[PDB]
């Protein structure tokens, strides 16, 4: 569910940790490959690597509950997009500090109930 | 001395409303029908025209 809600690169400042490595020039894909890019690819790998601007992990962590509910057969496989909606308007329209906390208790509990 | 004839046929129905149920097999078998549970997991809006 991290192959369905996490990207493979930068486009919102996700993967900030591995973008800080780039501007330290100690990367294992050669540090001499980062000094050979346009002035637009090093001016967005240094602005997304000094100031984080992370996305909400809610998409990932409601997609890890509903991808562990179809490996139980609790709901059909045609309801894996229709209960994605229903848990993004049940935890979102009644959101609080404690609702967010207890969303992360279904990342490990429901995962291992499989 | 019977004359040539044509046939008229009708029916009446009184004290009973016509009914069309919202089921796939057109018969009840629970108050909450099988097609009333297709917008009972995430709302969907449509126009109805009769």
Query: CB–CB of B42/A83 below 8 Å?
Result: yes
A47 Cα distance to chain centroid? 20
Contacts of B42 in chain A (CB under 8 A): 82-83, 85-86, 89
Helices (H) and strands (E) in chain B, counts: 0, 0
Task: Please tell me what DSSP assigns to residue B40.
Answer: S
Q: How far is CA A17 from CA A1, A44, A49, A112, in A?
A: 20, 14, 7, 28
In the block, which residue shows the tokens 């602005």?
A47
- Terminal C-alpha separation, chain A: 14
Instruction: Say whether B41 and A86 touch across the interface (CB within 8 A).
Output: yes
Closest residue on chain B to A88 (Cα) = B42
d(C-alpha A70, C-alpha A76), whole Å: 6
Residue among A96, A67, A60 nearest A81 (CA): A67
Query: CB–CB of A20/A49 below 8 Å?
Result: yes
Q: Mind spelling out the 3-state secondary structure of chain A?
A: CCCCCCCCCCCCCCCCCCCCCHHHCCCCCCCCCCCCCCCCCCCCCCCCCCCCCCCCCHHHHCCCCCCCCCCCCCCCCCCCCCCCCCCCCCCCCCCCHHHHHCCCCCCCCCCCCC
Resolution of the experimental model in angstroms, please? Answer: 3.1
d(C-alpha A59, C-alpha A81), whole Å: 12
Chain B contact for A85 (CB, 8 A cutoff): yes
Closest residue on chain A to B42 (Cα) = A86
């Amino acid at each position: 569910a991290a192959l369905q809600s996490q990207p493979s690169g930068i486009n919102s400042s996700d993967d900030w940790t591995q973008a800080m490595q780039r501007i330290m020039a100690l990367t294992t894909r050669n540090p001499e490959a980062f000094r050979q890019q346009p002035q637009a690819n090093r001016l967005s790998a240094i602005l997304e690597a000094v100031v984080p601007s992370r996305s909400n992990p809610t998409h990932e962590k409601v997609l890890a509950i509903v991808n562990a509910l179809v490996e139980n057969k609790a709901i059909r496989g045609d309801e894996a997009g229709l209960v994605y909606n229903a848990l993004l308007e049940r935890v979102a329209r009644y959101n609080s500090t404690n609702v967010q906390t207890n969303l992360d208790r279904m990342v490990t509990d429901v995962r291992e109930a499989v | 001395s019977a004359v040539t004839s044509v046939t008229q046929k009708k029916f009446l129905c009184d004290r009973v409303m016509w009914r069309i149920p919202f089921s796939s097999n057109f018969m009840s078998m629970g108050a909450l029908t099988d097609l009333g549970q297709n917008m009972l997991y995430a709302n969907s809006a449509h126009a109805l025209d009769m």
